Structures are given as structure tokens and as C-alpha cells.
Amino acid sequence: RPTFYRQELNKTIWEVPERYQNLSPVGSGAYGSVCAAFDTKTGLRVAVKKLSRPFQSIIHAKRTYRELRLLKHMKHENVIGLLDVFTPARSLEEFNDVYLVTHLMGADLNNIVKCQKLTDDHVQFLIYQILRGLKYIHSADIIHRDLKPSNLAVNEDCELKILDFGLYVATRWYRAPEIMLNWMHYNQTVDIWSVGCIMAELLTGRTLFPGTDHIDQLKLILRLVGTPGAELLKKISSESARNYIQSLTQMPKMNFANVFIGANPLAVDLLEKMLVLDSDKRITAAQALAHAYFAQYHDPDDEPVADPYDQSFESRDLLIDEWKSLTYDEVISFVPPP
Numbered sequence: 001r002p003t004f005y006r007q008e009l010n011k012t013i014w015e016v017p018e019r020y021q022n023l024s025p026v027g028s029g030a031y032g033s034v035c036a037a038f039d040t041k042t043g044l045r046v047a048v049k050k051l052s053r054p055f056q057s058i059i060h061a062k063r064t065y066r067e068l069r070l071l072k073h074m075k076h077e078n079v080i081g082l083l084d085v086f087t088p089a090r091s092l093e094e095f096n097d098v099y100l101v102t103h104l105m106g107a108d109l110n111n112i113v114k115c116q117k118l119t120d121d122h123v124q125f126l127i128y129q130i131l132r133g134l135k136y137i138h139s140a141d142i143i144h145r146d147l148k149p150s151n152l153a154v155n156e157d158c159e160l161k162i163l164d165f166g167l168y169v170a171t172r173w174y175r176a177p178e179i180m181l182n183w184m185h186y187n188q189t190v191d192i193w194s195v196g197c198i199m200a201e202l203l204t205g206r207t208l209f210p211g212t213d214h215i216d217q218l219k220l221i222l223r224l225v226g227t228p229g230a231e232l233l234k235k236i237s238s239e240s241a242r243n244y245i246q247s248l249t250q251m252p253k254m255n256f257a258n259v260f261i262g263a264n265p266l267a268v269d270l271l272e273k274m275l276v277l278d279s280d281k282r283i284t285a286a287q288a289l290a291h292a293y294f295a296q297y298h299d300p301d302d303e304p305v306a307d308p309y310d311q312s313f314e315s316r317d318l319l320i321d322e323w324k325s326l327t328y329d330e331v332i333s334f335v336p337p338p
């Protein structure tokens with residue numbers, strides 16, 4: 001019950017509202033494809049993502065639902081906002097496709113560095129905006145766990161936006177050590193570790209830890225931060241992980257000031273606070289927002305938290321049709337922000 005319209009671009013069929021004009025394949029897939037388009041109704045450039053077989057399996061179905069639920073709840077200036085969700089289906093019975101619309105960004109952070117290494121005052125603005133989005137997200141028990149340059153995009157102007165599944169840079173390069181081999185219990189500081197990795201690259205132009213595998217990755221990490229202290233080992237519950245770790249040639253911690261020569265010493269001190277092996281002593285997004293490095297931008301009366309998000313459904317074990325149905329209600333009940 002708008003004006004829809006087919007378009008076999010890509011190699012897949014796209015049935016979208018007439019308001020969405022100028023469909024341009026942005027690329028990729030596995031979980032679906034995105035196109036750059038123009039919103040006739042708001043006169044704005046947008047990205048339209050059509051999911052690949054949203055309800056093909058129980059994992060597809062839960063994936064779909066999990067994303068809708070999240071986006072619909074996302075209201076922050078540093079987090080990708082859901083502009084519109086739509087389906088060519090008029091009934092739940094013929095519900096087989098789902099599309100998600102967002103603003104079109106200027107570019108990712110991936111390329112921003114590929115072009116080169118940015119200014120310090122430019123890095124502060126970026127890292128601050130990322131951390132601001134993480135306070136929000138983290139406040140509602142949401143962990144990104146997938147932080148990497150391509151999942152960071154910049155506003156029409158210069159507003160940073162966190163997204164996911166952004167369209168060969170390994171996400172493992174930014175993964176915190178504790179979740180890099182089942183290692184053990186992990187919290188949201190897993191995201192902070194990633195941040196420190198992204199910040200370093202932006203400062204240096206090079207990938208901080210470009211491991212070729214999980215084994216090599218950890219090796220690259222323990223080389224910089226050094227092998228686990230006997231205090232950290234006290235908190236490792238797995239006997240195998242313990243043996244493995246202890247059986248490594250003990251590496252000492254490097255002085256970041258040495259690794260990052262010429263870098264803002266405030267920028268360096270933060271990095272020392274983020275790239276900590278013990279998830280328990282890692283700086284949180286909120287604490288880092290108060291760090292001197294961002295005194296220029298910090299504004300504790302403008303760094304908001306999120307309102308409670310219920311993720312009970314994650315626990316649930318339903319059927320394809322129950323996730324599908326639930327996804328339907330979610331599409332229907334959608335209220336366009338402005």
C-alpha cells in the first residue's frame with residue numbers, strides 16, 4: 001500500500017517503494033546487499049539493504065529479527081538510525097522479504113585511513129564520537145563485538161556513525177584477546193579493545209595487529225602488551241588456555257610512547273588504558289569519555305545512555321515461523337522516526 005516497483009539489478013530482484021529512486025548497487029552480500037538510492041519523500045540520499053533469504057533457516061530468521069529489534073530501538077547521533085523497514089508482502093502469509101533503509105554516509109573509516117593518516121584533532125573527534133555511541137549502546141547491555149574501520153561511517157558533514165555488516169580487512173585484527181579463542185568470559189570492554197586498535201591505525205596509518213590467524217593474532221598482541229601477569233592468570237579458569245599461555249616465552253610490555261613516537265602523549269596514554277589484556281581493568285567507554293584526550297569535545301551533560309533493551313528473546317528457541325511472525329509484527333508496528 002504504497003507505489004512499489006521491481007528492478008532486477010544485482011542479479012536479485014528488488015521490490016521497493018517509488019519514494020526510493022535511483023537504485024545503485026553498493027555491493028557485497030552473505031547476509032544481503034545494499035544499494036545507494038534517493039528518497040523522493042524526504043529528498044535525502046539513502047542506503048537500502050535487502051536481506052538474503054531472511055527466513056530460510058532458524059538462524060536466518062533469528063538474525064533478521066535480532067537486527068530489526070535492535071535498529072528500531074537505536075536512537076543516538078553516533079549510531080546508525082533506522083529510517084524505514086518495508087516488505088512487498090501485504091500479509092504475513094506472503095512475508096518472505098525484508099528491507100532496511102538508512103541514511104547514506106559520506107564514507108567509511110576504512111577508506112579514510114587508506115587515503116592516509118588523519119590529523120590528531122581529527123582523530124579526537126572520531127574516537128570521541130565512537131566512544132559516545134558505545135556509552136549509549138553499552139548502557140543497554142548491547143555489545144557490538146564487530147568493531148572495525150568498515151563499520152564506522154561519516155555523516156554528510158563529519159558526524160560519525162556506528163553500524164554493522166558495513167559494505168580484505170579481517171575483523172579478527174580488532175577482536176579483543178578474551179574472545180579470540182573462546183578464551184573466557186567477556187564483557188563490553190571487548191569493544192574498547194577494538195577502539196584502541198582503530199585509534200592506533202588512525203594515528204599511524206597501519207594496522208596495529210594484522211594477525212593471519214587466531215594463533216598469530218594473539219602472538220602479535222602479547223608482543224605489544226606483553227604476556228599475561230600472574231595476577232591475570234589467577235582469573236583464567238581453563239586449564240588448557242593456562243598451559244598454552246604459560247608455555248609461551250614471556251614477553252614484556254612495550255612502552256606505548258615508544259611504539260607511538262611523535263603521537264600526542266594524551267592520545268598515547270588513552271591507548272595504554274584501552275589496550276589492556278585484563279578485561280577487568282580496561283577503560284570503559286564512559287570513563288574514556290572523561291579522559292583528557294577529549295577535553296575539547298567532552299560534555300558529560302550531552303553523552304546520554306540508552307533506555308533498557310530487552311534481549312530475553314536471545315534465550316528463546318522458536319520455529320522459523322515464530323521468528324518470522326515476530327519479525328512481521330516488528331515491520332508493521334514501525335513508526336518512521338523524524
Ligand SMILES: Cc1ccc(NC(=O)c2cccc(N3CCOCC3)c2)cc1Nc1ncnn2cc(C(=O)N[C@@H](C)c3ccccc3)c(C)c12
Nearest residue numbers: 047048049100102104105106107108162163164165166167
Ligand atoms: C542500509 C542499512 C540497513 C541495515 C543496517 N544494519 C546495521 O547497520 C546494524 C545491524 C546490526 C547492528 C548494528 N549495530 C549498530 C551499533 O551497535 C549495535 C550494533 C547495526 C545497515 C545499513 N547500512 C549500511 N549497511 C551496509 N553498508 N553500508 C554502507 C553505508 C554507507 O553509507 N556507505 C558509504 C561510505 C557510502 C557512500 C557512498 C556510496 C557507497 C557507500 C551504509 C549507510 C551501509
